[PDB]
Design an enzyme around this catalytic site. Structure first.
Site, PDB file in Angstrom:
ATOM      1  N   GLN A  20       0.846  -1.213   0.000  1.00  0.00           N
ATOM      2  CA  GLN A  20       0.000   0.000   0.000  1.00  0.00           C
ATOM      3  C   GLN A  20       0.878   1.259   0.000  1.00  0.00           C
ATOM      4  O   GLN A  20       0.340   2.332  -0.338  1.00  0.00           O
ATOM      5  CB  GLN A  20      -0.969  -0.036   1.180  1.00  0.00           C
ATOM      6  CG  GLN A  20      -0.300   0.051   2.531  1.00  0.00           C
ATOM      7  CD  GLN A  20      -1.249  -0.200   3.677  1.00  0.00           C
ATOM      8  OE1 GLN A  20      -1.718  -1.308   3.899  1.00  0.00           O
ATOM      9  NE2 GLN A  20      -1.562   0.862   4.387  1.00  0.00           N
ATOM     10  N   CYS A  26      -5.219   0.414   3.444  1.00  0.00           N
ATOM     11  CA  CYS A  26      -5.315  -1.010   3.865  1.00  0.00           C
ATOM     12  C   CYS A  26      -6.722  -1.541   3.526  1.00  0.00           C
ATOM     13  O   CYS A  26      -6.846  -2.679   3.032  1.00  0.00           O
ATOM     14  CB  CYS A  26      -5.011  -1.206   5.349  1.00  0.00           C
ATOM     15  SG  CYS A  26      -5.995  -0.165   6.436  1.00  0.00           S
ATOM     16  N   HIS A 163      -6.252  -1.730  11.514  1.00  0.00           N
ATOM     17  CA  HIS A 163      -5.642  -2.289  10.281  1.00  0.00           C
ATOM     18  C   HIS A 163      -6.623  -3.263   9.608  1.00  0.00           C
ATOM     19  O   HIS A 163      -7.458  -3.877  10.316  1.00  0.00           O
ATOM     20  CB  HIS A 163      -4.308  -2.947  10.615  1.00  0.00           C
ATOM     21  CG  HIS A 163      -3.504  -3.261   9.394  1.00  0.00           C
ATOM     22  ND1 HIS A 163      -3.524  -2.453   8.273  1.00  0.00           N
ATOM     23  CD2 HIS A 163      -2.641  -4.257   9.140  1.00  0.00           C
ATOM     24  CE1 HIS A 163      -2.726  -2.970   7.356  1.00  0.00           C
ATOM     25  NE2 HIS A 163      -2.132  -4.067   7.890  1.00  0.00           N
ATOM     26  N   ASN A 183      -1.181  -9.657   4.400  1.00  0.00           N
ATOM     27  CA  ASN A 183      -0.995  -8.219   4.703  1.00  0.00           C
ATOM     28  C   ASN A 183      -0.747  -7.467   3.383  1.00  0.00           C
ATOM     29  O   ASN A 183      -0.596  -8.119   2.338  1.00  0.00           O
ATOM     30  CB  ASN A 183       0.061  -8.062   5.796  1.00  0.00           C
ATOM     31  CG  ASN A 183       0.015  -6.733   6.526  1.00  0.00           C
ATOM     32  OD1 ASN A 183      -0.790  -5.868   6.220  1.00  0.00           O
ATOM     33  ND2 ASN A 183       0.921  -6.548   7.466  1.00  0.00           N
TER      34      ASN A 183
END
Ligand SMILES: CC(C)C[C@H](NC(=O)c1ccc(-c2csc(N3CCN(C)CC3)n2)c(F)c1)C(=O)N1C[C@@H](N)[C@H]2OC[C@H](O)[C@H]21
Ligand SMILES: NC(=O)CN(CC(=O)O)CC(=O)O
Length: 216
Positions: A20, A26, A163, A183
């Site tokens: 990102q 996110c 997150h 992630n």
């Protein structure tokens, strides 16, 4: 009986890990990962969808200043599409909406929320539906410093979500039940961009508190 373990990476439902960069996006990476999973299931095609499309065009979110995945799914439904990454590439800064129906690569017919706190309902959704969008407390250096094994920190705050990530499976490693988490911090973070996070341990880091998936 629901499987003891599920890993969507082994079945071709998960695209490569992205970065990102210096953008609060996110939520857009989490959203497109869940859409990419349902697109492969439905149409047989694995392809990169556009997080930039969501950052620029989801007016209920704040672009590079953060958002919710439920607002992303609602946008794709109301907009009647989302572009591919190839048609609408990621630049990591907000610009005016450049959505083009000619680049359209997926649709959405609504979304479903996992009942808050219910890790068994999240397990069943991952087994039956596919990768699920989830929110966690990722604020601890222990999370930043992850490399291997099943992540658990008693100081993780299940009440302080900060997150958005993607649950691409679950299983058990040397008796430690876990979630398989993709992630959006690049392949050089964690274990090639992934982290195993404690499962059925008091809803560790809030993993079942804000979980959702799109319908196609
Ligand atoms: C699933 C959650 C936990 C994700 C989280 N989401 C929010 O934090 C959030 C923030 C803002 C709005 C909002 C929607 S509309 C509006 N505004 C309109 C008018 N202007 C004036 C004010 C802001 N703000 C939102 F919906 C949500 C998020 O994206 N985050 C958390 C941050 N630490 C960032 O780091 C990781 C991720 O890259 C960013
Ligand atoms: N019962 C199964 O085949 C479950 N599988 C994983 C899956 O189906 O995603 C286990 C494995 O690959 O070790």
């Amino acid at each position: 009986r629901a499987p003891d373990s599920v890993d969507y990476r082994k079945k071709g439902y998960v695209t490569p890990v992205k970065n990102q960069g210096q953008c609060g996006s996110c939520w857009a990476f989490s959203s497109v990962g869940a859409l990419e999973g349902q697109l492969k299931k439905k149409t047989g095609k694995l392809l990169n969808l556009s997080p930039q499309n969501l950052v620029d065009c989801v007016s209920e979110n704040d672009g590079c200043g953060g958002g919710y995945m439920t607002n992303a799914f609602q946008y794709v439904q109301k907009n009647r599409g989302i572009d591919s990454e190839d048609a609408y590439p990621y630049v990591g800064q907000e610009e005016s909406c450049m959505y083009n129906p000619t680049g359209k690569a997926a649709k959405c017919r609504g979304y479903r929320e996992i009942p808050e706190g219910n890790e068994k309902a999240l397990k069943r959704a991952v087994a039956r539906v596919g990768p699920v969008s989830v929110a966690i407390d990722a604020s601890l250096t222990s999370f930043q410093f992850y490399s291997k094994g099943v992540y658990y920190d008693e100081s993780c705050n299940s009440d302080n979500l900060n997150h958005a990530v993607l649950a691409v499976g679950y299983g058990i490693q040397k008796g430690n039940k876990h979630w398989i988490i993709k992630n959006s911090w690049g392949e050089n973070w964690g274990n090639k961009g992934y982290i195993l996070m404690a499962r059925n341990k008091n809803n560790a880091c809030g993993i079942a508190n804000l979980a959702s998936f799109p319908k196609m």
